[PDB]
Amino acid sequence: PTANLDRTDDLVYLNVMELVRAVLELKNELAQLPPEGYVVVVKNVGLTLRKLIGSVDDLLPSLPSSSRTEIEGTQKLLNKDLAELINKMRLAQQNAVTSLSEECKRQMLTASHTLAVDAKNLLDAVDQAKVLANLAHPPA
């Protein structure tokens, strides 16, 4: 599970939920959505990711350099995650009505899902880092 901290001022934490929401939108809207409708949902995931990464970069200064590292670690990974979600989405768009019509959509669901899981692991490291740097406070 996740740390229980004071989330009221945790912009990281909120950006994670939003991203998870966007990812969740995608999941149970692919079956319904048309090909041009794919760009929009993938865009929101992207949008909430850049929000997220921005609020982590704002923090990265005030925290330990061994954590700066695996944070920057998964931050890199998340870009690689979005890259794949876009490209699988483009495939899915271009391969509506062909052999791997469905197979490309499975790949979108995978890519977004693993994006959500990584974002969580980002939150987790961030939580630990705040603790390790006397920065964290218990739920209010």
Partner: peptide, 13 residues
């Protein structure tokens, strides 16, 4: 560092 991400973000739409 944000240069790689807004590259992908520009590409769609």
């Amino acid at each position: 560092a944000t240069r790689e991400l807004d590259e992908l973000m520009a590409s769609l739409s």
